[PDB]
Design a protein around this ligand. Structure first.
Ligand SMILES: COc1cc2nc(N3CCc4c(ccn(CC5CC5)c4=O)C3)[nH]c(=O)c2cc1OCC1C=C1
Ligand SMILES: COc1cc2nc(N3CCc4c(ccn(CC5CC5)c4=O)C3)[nH]c(=O)c2cc1OCC1C=C1
Ligand SMILES: COc1cc2nc(N3CCc4c(ccn(CC5CC5)c4=O)C3)[nH]c(=O)c2cc1OCC1C=C1
Lengths: 450, 450, 450
């Protein structure tokens, strides 16, 4: 049967001490609430009702493209009142799962077990075992069913030893939600309408509530401050790393590895310590990434080595290329197979053809470079003091001598040779040699200070 | 009532295998003994008696500016003998707290509880609970008072199960210290005068000794070798990070963060992995620090992003500036609001005005640069082969073409334009364009090797 | 008496998902099997029989220089069958220790205790205690001898509570091995000849099997996938770091330190976070290594500071030199005492004499530089577009002005001075000053865009 989700996302998150609302804070580069939306989506949710409030304008801008129903709650009167705002949109004969935008690590697999266990006209409640369950509502089981959730203050001596606890995550059908939400009261110390009370109300109707234990506590742990958020971060990164290691990626130290997006990999990939992978990255077979590298939105071909302290963004690198150390590839850098990019080199929005080398102290911007070129140390593409930034075109088999400026727009044809220290402003023809004629003054017997 | 401190700092620290004395080894960039002096100071100590011995000359040079009474002990005959060297300086009616220069993590808050609990004419003894208390003197309580400290070898079966242990840290009034120290003997296996024996001597006088438990074991743990020192370091750094996280600083991974000094911060500051903050650093609102950065003695304005692998020292950066990646700011670098400093750029003792950009492969030293300037890739300020290093002055709205050397002393006035590849030795006037006239030899049909 | 080793190394290692065989995967830069060969060697092994199979060609190329007997097993019929392939080479009156190429952390010290405990004509079995011993053969002791190894499935209730477990590591004399291996059968659920069965067979002969507990579990843990391999890596690195710390090396954070080879050190060496030491490295007294540095096959003299993000390979650095930050030393870099190498500088196969400085944005390759030289920012050694790469020779007390290209082959004699922006192609004589005569066009009243 069909399924929809409700995600609670209205919290201010005061203890974050932030201008952002609570659920927009990120884990692995992605807002907490986005993790939960994505999980709801892969679970098969037909609709996702996003209950929001605080920082409303920011929620809308940061999540503009999310396929969710925006339910703006105007007052915080408890979670049952919050969920009830979405209730008119529930189909009677679909399941509804309730999730929390500040508990981002809840998994599809746990939620599939929760939904599968839901008895008809009843509730499936996600629970978890804690070593120190102080403060949290204890799960009371009679037979295989939950008959109550007794809070800390009400529990007797024996009930306090119960380790099983309420997570707030639950699944019931839409008609049942509409019915029971209307019957929730606010007669308690906080004066709030608690979603917790649905368990009691279901039992009032002789409906079955069954418990399903989450396997990992961190799946149901929320973050109320940045300390707790960093704990979720580290747990998540460790889990991502472990998956990659079991898939055959050699991560030298999983505690010093960060993935903030998606990684596609081949076999025998090696990733040294303190590497960050961001956005969508694809690594081919036998790619080796040295320490300190940052790769954001890149495709790296088979047999590429990236040496330490290289930073790459929005770039493509062909097979058997060698990059680094201290290389920077900026958006639009496209390196062909068997290229070489070296230390203190910056490449921006340029193509570099097969076998070409750019190995030191060089800036190449807005350029096309052909195959088997030799770009000397200190070479710089530049522009006139004008308006827009023009293109430098270098053909195949060109030698550009060290410390030469190429002044765009300019074209250097196949097989040209340019001497060191040259300023190139005019087009260079095929097989043309250009050498700078220097004038020097030589003074003999010039004694330097002793 | 008044308070003074005695700090024991005379140890050689043989197992450090160092030419430094034990207590000069650092935690978070600061000598262990300095942590303890600082704590004594914020506790309200009127005097701080520093008992020193081994590496005396080094202690004096490294701690020359500390407001302490230098008590040089000439022979090591135990801690009671050590403290007695300072005793003539104790005021009869002040409290005296005894602390250890090799146990740097003791806190003001723990010591305030210790002092508050001290009964008049008695002692307050700081104790701690250990899971494995083997080797340490057990605390024996009769009623709410300490009647003995029984060492490992003397304890019976039941006394060995006591987890509460002596830390050596204690508070009593000055007259009591002078009295009891004079009565300590050296009749034991080590032949030493132990400060421990004051507890027995107080009980001999029908004076009350009360125990106060330290909350954290690491507060009273000393470091005898560099392995133990690194454990204290990691604990301290984790504690600093946690405080910052609870204050609203987003530290992506607190295990990969080091603060070696003080940090002042605004709201919504983000600090990526492997950042080191040294000396006194001030970060404004919404500052983002990328991975690998080192900031020492810097002020960073609101909305600055520092990209990966940037190293900054003794520098100021205005709001909305963009630094990095691979940028180096050396002492005296002052960047105005909305500036841009890029990869493989070094700025030393120079001011850079609002909106100006220095984005690649450049050295700017001893310079003043105005607003809205464009400093091209490969630009270098340099000097003649002479004596001292002179200044380059660049005005507002100046364009300096790529790979130009500016030869100090020289002035470039407002609105000037300098072509690429220029050597500037003479002053450039307002709205003056300077272009290098190059001579080139062009040889057609020059075939390069196949 | 004599000793030889047998090392089992034939596994495919399917769950590594690799083109490499299992035991060639590295820990601290060295194949797992190599760790075990090295341990066997320092134990005093006369012969080392290496049982190999899967990835045979790769084993032979990667371990070509290992002093081992290559025993190629053609079918996998169990470990007893494997060891029996080597048995014809066992001397009757030598001890034989059996080790595993996928359990690299086994130590010499543990193995010496194992061998010492071996009763004559009997077996010494290495065992270990586990908290959860499920799946592993339990050690059954009657008196001080092992009478059986009962597998999980056969054990009764009380035997499952035994925490002591079989590691597979054992020592017996050669004649005993030849005898008992011939009597091992394959009547079990897997149809394999298990080396485990020797314990039963020894007991059949009224021969004594004695247990020896390994002190650390990680010594006998094998790695079947890259997750488990990373755990061994981290344990090994922590152990190496701890040893260095106890020897007096200040490693600021042992969890962010990697040694992949050997380290020789003096006193008062400091190593900041995220440093990697590879190959054979020697550091003198008071060497300070900043964060992010990579040192591979280097000798560093007394009192050298290496500042952050410096990468050094196959290089020598004299006392009191200063390197970094952002310095790169490539193979053959030899820096004399009191030299200075700075940011965005690359030195390859060059010698730099005492007191000389190369402090910014410079490439020096295939060069000899003398004492007290000043190599300006932007200086580049380069070659003509020819065949091989020639040498630049610079004498003592030479000043090379900024952004000068030195075009090899060329010689600059003692005391020469070269102006900024020069192209040097011809030899410069002693005390010769060379200055570039520039031609410039100056255009007054050139208004740039507003
Ligand atoms: C960010 O928005 C909200 C997230 C919210 N998240 C939760 N939960 C996630 C965190 C959490 C919950 C229950 C138990 N635990 C402890 C874990 C051991 C079991 C949690 O961490 C329930 N519970 C809430 O009541 C809630 C309200 C929120 O506010 C909106 C709704 C109107 C109130
Ligand atoms: C560096 O100088 C000294 C530091 C010293 N520090 C200490 N303590 C700090 C370390 C420490 C102490 C007591 C217990 N513990 C274990 C912890 C569980 C409780 C300590 O780590 C006492 N105890 C000393 O006797 C001492 C002597 C020292 O030498 C000078 C004084 C003349 C002897
Ligand atoms: C890589 O090659 C092999 C390594 C092999 N390594 C082992 N061991 C190392 C790993 C390991 C063993 C025993 C117990 N444990 C668990 C630890 C708690 C005690 C191990 O991890 C024995 N045991 C094997 O049977 C074996 C076979 C191997 O295959 C070759 C031989 C023909 C089969």
């Amino acid at each position: 049967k069909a399924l929809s989700a409700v995600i609670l996302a209205a919290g201010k998150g005061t203890r974050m001490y932030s201008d952002l609302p609570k659920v927009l804070h990120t884990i692995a580069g992605k807002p907490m609430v986005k993790h939960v939306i994505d999980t709801a989506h892969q679970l098969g949710s037909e609709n996702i009702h996003l209950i929001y409030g605080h920082g409303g304008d920011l929620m809308r801008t940061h999540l503009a493209n999310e396929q969710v129903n925006w339910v703006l709650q105007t007052e915080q009167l408890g979670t049952a009142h919050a969920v009830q705002q979405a209730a008119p949109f529930f189909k009677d004969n679909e399941n509804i799962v309730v999730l929390y935008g500040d508990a981002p690590l809840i998994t599809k697999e746990t939620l599939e077990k929760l939904i599968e266990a839901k008895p008809e006209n009843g509730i499936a409640l996600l629970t978890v075992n804690l070593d120190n369950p102080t403060g949290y509502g204890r799960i009371i089981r009679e037979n295989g069913n939950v008959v109550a959730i007794v809070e800390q203050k009400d529990a007797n001596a024996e009930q306090l030893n119960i380790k099983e606890v309420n997570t707030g995550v639950m699944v019931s059908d839409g008609a049942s939600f509409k019915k029971w939400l209307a019957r929730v009261g606010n007669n308690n110390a906080q004066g709030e309408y608690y979603l917790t009370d649905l368990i009691a109300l279901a039992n009032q109707d002789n409906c079955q509530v069954v418990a399903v234990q989450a396997t990992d506590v961190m799946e149901v742990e929320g973050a109320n401050n940045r300390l707790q958020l960093a704990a979720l971060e580290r747990y998540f990164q460790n889990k991502q790393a472990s998956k990659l290691l079991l898939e055959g990626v050699m991560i030298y130290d999983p505690a010093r590895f960060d993935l903030r997006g998606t990684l596609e990999h081949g076999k025998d990939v090696e990733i040294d310590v303190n590497v960050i992978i961001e956005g969508n990255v694809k690594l081919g077979d036998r790619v080796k990434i040295g320490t300190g590298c940052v790769l954001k939105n890149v495709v790296i071909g088979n047999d590429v080595e990236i040496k330490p302290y290289s930073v790459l963004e929005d770039s493509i690198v062909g097979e058997k290329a060698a990059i680094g150390p201290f290389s920077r590839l900026r958006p639009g850098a496209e390196l062909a197979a068997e290229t070489h990019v070296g230390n203190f080199v910056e490449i921006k929005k340029s193509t570099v053809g097969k076998g070409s080398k750019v190995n030191h102290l060089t800036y190449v911007g807005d350029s096309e470079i052909g195959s088997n070129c030799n770009i000397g140390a200190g070479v710089i593409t530049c522009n006139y003091d004008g308006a827009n930034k023009f293109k430098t075109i270098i053909g195949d088999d060109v030698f550009v001598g060290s410390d030469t400026q190429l002044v765009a727009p300019v074209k250097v044809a196949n097989g040209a040779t340019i001497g060191a220290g040259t300023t190139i402003t005019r087009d260079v023809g095929e097989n043309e040699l250009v050498i700078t004629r220097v004038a020097q003054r030589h003074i003999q017997g010039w004694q330097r200070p002793i």
